[PDB]
Amino acid sequence: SHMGELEAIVGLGLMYSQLPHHILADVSLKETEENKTKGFDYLLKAAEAGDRQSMILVARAFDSGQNLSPDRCQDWLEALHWYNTALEMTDCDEGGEYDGMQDEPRYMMLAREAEMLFTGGYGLEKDPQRSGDLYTQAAEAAMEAMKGRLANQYYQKAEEAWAQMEE
């Protein structure tokens, strides 16, 4: 025989009205919603909205200078103001710190604020007594957090504050 070998592929070329979605499927949305939500105005609008985490973000943004952008005047009074707010509006200070993950470390926030207030920065007033007291609150918060080393560290910092406070 001499037929049947090498079958010509004919009667093919159908089912084109389906079109695999793996090809030729523009499903890209022209809406950069996520972009403007990652913008300074949003963080601070949410800071004014009442979002504690967002307040901490803008605070550290003013402090670190990074997200504040370097083309803007570095003010630490606004930062201080926001740190105050976070501490004053937290419900984990009066015996309500039972989350497990300390995403808001009271003692470290207090410590930073203390240092800020005790140093100054031209625009921020140096109030030694507030810093001393703040170190004590920080260290006590650390004691409560079973952070003995940090407590005695800022306590030693506190002792030096009142030692230099005697002027």
Describe this structure in words.
This protein is an all-alpha fold and 167 residues long. It has one domain (1-167). It is 54% helix and 0% strand. It contains seven helices and no strands. It is elongated and about 115 Å long. The protein starts with 32 loop residues before the first helix and ends with a helix. It is classed as translation. The entry lists the keywords eEF2K, eEF2, binding domain, kinase, transferase, SEL1, elongation, TPR, translation. The assembly is monomeric.
Layout: helices, strands, pairs:
Blueprint: H1 33-37, H2 40-49, H3 52-64, H4 76-88, H5 106-119, H6 128-144, H7 148-165
Helix pairs in contact: 2-3, 3-4, 4-5, 5-6, 6-7
PDB class: translation
Keywords: eEF2K, eEF2, binding domain, kinase, transferase, SEL1, elongation, TPR, translation
Assembly: monomeric
In a few lines, what is going on in this structure?
The chain has 167 residues and is mostly helical. It has seven helices and no strands.
- Sum up the overall morphology in one term: elongated
Number of domains in the coordinates? 1
Q: Helix count?
A: 7
Kindly, what is the distance between the CA atoms of the first and last residues, rounded to a whole number of angstroms?
117 Å
Rg over CA atoms: 30 Å
Beta strand count: 0
Provide the β-strand percentage band: under 5%
- Major sheet summary line: none
Category by helix and strand content: mainly alpha
Order of helices and strands: HHHHHHH
PDB class: translation
Keywords: eEF2K, eEF2, binding domain, kinase, transferase, SEL1, elongation, TPR, translation
Assembly: monomeric
Entry title: Structure of the C-terminal Helical Repeat Domain of Eukaryotic Elongation Factor 2 Kinase (eEF-2K)
